[PDB]
């Protein structure tokens, strides 16, 4: 059972972790802002999938 | 008749890319709706165990 809340309890706090996905703006060409990881795999599966 | 022709196949290219556009957008929906779906049974089968 300790085992159990504490995988959940892991899950929880990186659920409070803000991921910060920077702002479309058309314009600005080149600034290299990093993609969160999240963005990154959400979207390879997703590209994956439509392919 | 050539001419018209022409034009005709001009104007089938217009919509077919379209078409083609509308096709590819509407599959990247489905795609993001069937991760979310597979989201939701795995989710189900960790609340059995």
């Given at each position: 059972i300790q085992y159990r809340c504490e995988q959940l309890q892991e899950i929880r706090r990186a659920s409070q972790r803000e991921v910060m996905f920077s702002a479309v703006?058309?314009?600005?060409?080149?600034?290299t802002f990093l993609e969160p990881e999240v963005l990154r795999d959400v979207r390879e599966v997703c590209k994956l999938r439509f392919k | 008749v050539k001419g018209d022709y022409d034009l005709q196949m001009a104007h089938q290219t217009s919509c077919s890319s379209r078409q083609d556009l509308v096709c590819d957008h509407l599959m990247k929906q489905k795609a993001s709706f069937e991760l979310l779906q597979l989201g939701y049974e795995l989710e189900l089968r960790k609340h059995r165990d």
């Open positions: 703006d058309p314009d600005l060409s080149s600034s | -």
